[PDB]
Design a protein around this ligand. Structure first.
Ligand code: HEM
Ligand SMILES: [C-]#N
Length: 137
């Protein structure tokens, strides 16, 4: 279930974070523009870069914190507020986050691993809702 999936992801966080983030960028290539350092680079070029792995690890660490702190896949308002108030998130709308969870759910369903993809879909939905409540346009 959802709780186990957090453990699955955390067990190999760097690998899953890079794979899912790439799945996001590749499904929605318009989103790559937000990430100047990643423009014009293949998956393998990005995986070779320590900074790319470090960035994706930090993002997915926090996502996993928000997921673990949630009750029944409903995230805490304070966590949504953190995400809205991140300086690097200033120009973003909830659609950016919606896209990320579409790609994440797609990745889980395509994977050989037994992810609770429906729970991640619900979690994504509830997070988008919470981002809006915290003031994200
Ligand atoms: C739940 C999902 C997300 C989480 C937990 C998250 C979290 C974070 C964190 C912790 C950082 C700082 C890490 C660092 O300095 O490298 C960061 C940076 C950033 N985030 Fe997110 N983020 C999420 C989704 C998104 C989305 C969907 C976008 C837009 C497509 C986005 C755009 C950015 C950008 C542009 C930066 C700065 C990257 C850079 O200049 O190196 N984030 N995010
Ligand atoms: C945020 N990536």
């Amino acid at each position: 279930g959802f709780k186990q999936d957090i453990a699955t992801i955390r067990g190999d966080l760097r690998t899953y974070a890079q794979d899912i983030f790439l799945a996001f960028l590749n499904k929605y290539p318009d989103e790559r523009r937000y990430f100047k350092n990643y423009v014009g680079k293949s998956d393998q070029e990005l995986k070779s870069m320590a900074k790319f792995g470090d960035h994706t690890e930090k993002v997915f660490n926090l996502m996993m914190e928000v997921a673990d702190r949630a009750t029944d896949c409903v995230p805490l308002a304070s966590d949504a507020n953190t995400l809205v108030q991140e300086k690097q998130h200033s120009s973003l709308t909830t659609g950016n986050f919606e896209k990320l969870f579409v790609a994440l759910v797609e990745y889980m369903r395509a994977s050989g691993q037994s992810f609770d993809s429906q729970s991640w879909d619900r979690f994504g939905k509830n997070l988008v809702s919470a981002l809006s409540s915290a003031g994200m346009k």
